[PDB]
Amino acid sequence: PNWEFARMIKEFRVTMECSPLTPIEEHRICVCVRKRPLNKQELAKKEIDVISVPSKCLLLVHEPKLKVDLTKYLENQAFCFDFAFDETASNEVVYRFTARPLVQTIFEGGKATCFAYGQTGSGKTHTMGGDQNASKGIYAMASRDVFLLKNQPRYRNLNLEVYVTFFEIYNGKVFDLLNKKAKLRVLEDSRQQVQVVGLQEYLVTCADDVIKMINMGSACRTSGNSNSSRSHACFQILLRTKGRLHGKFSLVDLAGNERRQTRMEGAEINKSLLALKECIRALGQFRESKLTQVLRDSFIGENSRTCMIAMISPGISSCEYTLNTLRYADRVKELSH
Ligand X SMILES: Nc1ncnc2c1ncn2[C@@H]1O[C@H](COP(=O)(O)OP(=O)(O)O)[C@@H](O)[C@H]1O
User: Which residue ranges make up the annotated binding site for ATP?
Assistant: 34, 118-125
Burial zone of 203 (CB within 10 Å; 0-12 exposed, 13-18 middle, 19+ buried): exposed
Q: Do residues 99 and 138 make contact, with C-beta atoms less than 8 angstroms apart? A: yes
Smallest distance, ligand X to C-beta of residue 55, A: 19
Residue 132 site contact among ligand X, Mg ion, none (CB < 5 to 8 Å, cut-off depends on kind): none
How far is the CA of 139 from the CAs of 95, 175, 322, in angstroms? Answer: 10, 19, 25
The string of DSSP codes covering 156-207 is: HTT--EEEEEEEEE-SSSEEETTTTTEEEEEEE-SSS-EEEETPPPEEE-SH
Smallest distance, ligand X to C-beta of residue 284, A: 26
Rule CB under 6 A: say whether 122 interacts with ligand X: yes
Smallest distance, ligand X to C-beta of residue 35, A: 9
CA distance 140 to 78: 33
C-alpha 271 chain-centroid distance: 17
CA distance 38 to 19: 29
| Contact range with ligand X by CB under 6 A, out of 42-50, 97-105, 116-124, 156-164 | 116-124
Choose between 118 and 217: whose C-beta lies nearer to ligand X: 118
Q: Do residues 143 and 207 make contact, with C-beta atoms less than 8 angstroms apart? A: yes
Smallest distance, ligand X to C-beta of residue 281, A: 23
Rule CB under 5 A: say whether 292 interacts with Mg ion: no
CA distance 15 to 9: 10
- Cβ within 8 Å of residue 313, ≥6 positions away: 36, 42, 118, 119, 121, 122, 123, 321, 322
Choose between 104 and 133: whose C-beta lies nearer to Mg ion: 133
Of how many residues is the chain composed? 337
Choose between 39 and 76: whose C-beta lies nearer to ligand X: 39
Residues 302-331 that bind ligand X (CB under 6 A): 311
Smallest distance, ligand X to C-beta of residue 234, A: 14
Residues 191-220 that bind ligand X (CB under 6 A): none
| Contact range with ligand X by CB under 6 A, out of 4-12, 17-25, 123-131, 139-147 | 123-131
Rule CB under 5 A: say whether 298 interacts with Mg ion: no
| Contact range with ligand X by CB under 6 A, out of 95-103, 113-121, 174-182, 193-201 | 113-121
Contact with ligand X (CB under 6 A): which of 229, 266, 278, 281? Answer: 229
Contact with ligand X (CB under 6 A): which of 118, 217, 247, 315? Answer: 118
C-alpha 131 chain-centroid distance: 16
Q: Do residues 201 and 184 make contact, with C-beta atoms less than 8 angstroms apart? A: no
Contact with ligand X (CB under 6 A): which of 15, 31, 36, 146? Answer: 36
Residues 108-147 that bind Mg ion (CB under 5 A): 125
Smallest distance, ligand X to C-beta of residue 212, A: 21
Phi, psi of 32 (to 5 degrees): -135, 140
Contact residues toward ligand X (CB under 6 A) are: 36, 39, 118, 120-126, 131, 229, 311
Contact residues toward Mg ion (CB under 5 A) are: 125
